[PDB]
Amino acid sequence: LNAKVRLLREELQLLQEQGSYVGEVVRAMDKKKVLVKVHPEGKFVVDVDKN
């Protein structure tokens, strides 16, 4: 119950972080980059995290 209250009490800052776009990958390429369509905008050549 203590954990639940702590999570609820923090949730106000966690919910003020930005969001993340949803993109459709076109094809992985190059060292570790990918070409991602970000509906409705255009394509990008983005980096890929470590995980």
């Binding site: 070409l35 905008e41 255009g42 990008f44 983005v46 980096d47």
Partner: protein
């Protein structure tokens, strides 16, 4: 690989041989010197970290635009996906042999300066018209023509096989 043209008679001759021996000998000196340098120092670290500087200049969120007119002078008008039209500067590491109007160019996010290009599809029509190998058969299945096949071979195949014949006399193949 972007090698010199001998432009001797171009037909088996002594001058074609000496201009040919010369290029070979220069390539030999170059190869020896290069091998000596590589043994003396790998330069792998130096060649590397140039990739790092480049990737530093080109930020992570590279944007795929669409080149639309090269001013002929390391400048361009690159159109972002929405439809806006910017006037950016072409940097020094883009292989300019690959820059023609309509090419999917790779722009910087904050500055849209051109920093690369991408490949495109190979099937405007190439796939639909090319026939590849004929499933029916090779020249074996055709008989009785003999003369006609000879004509076609000389018209279309022989100018590809041995250009020297036509070239020697200064006559271009039939059209």
């Amino acid at each position: 690989a972007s090698k010199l043209p001998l432009v001797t008679p171009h037909t088996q001759c002594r001058l074609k041989l000496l201009k040919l021996e010369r290029i070979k000998d220069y390539l030999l000196m170059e190869e020896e010197f290069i091998r000596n340098q590589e043994q003396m120092k790998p330069l792998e670290e130096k060649q590397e970290e140039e990739r790092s500087k480049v990737d530093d200049l080109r930020g992570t969120p590279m944007s795929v635009g669409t080149l639309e007119e090269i001013i002929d002078d390391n400048h361009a008008i690159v159109s972002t996906s929405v439809g806006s039209e910017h006037y950016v500067s072409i940097l020094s590491f883009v292989d300019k042999d690959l820059l023609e109007p309509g090419c999917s160019v790779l722009l910087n996010h904050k500055v849209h300066a051109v920093i690369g290009v991408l490949m495109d599809d190979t099937d405007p029509l190439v796939t639909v018209m090319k026939v590849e190998k004929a499933p029916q058969e090779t020249y074996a299945d055709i008989g009785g023509l003999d003369n006609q096949i000879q004509e076609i071979k000389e018209s279309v195949e022989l100018p590809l096989t041995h250009p020297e014949y036509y070239e020697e006399m200064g006559i271009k193949p039939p059209k």
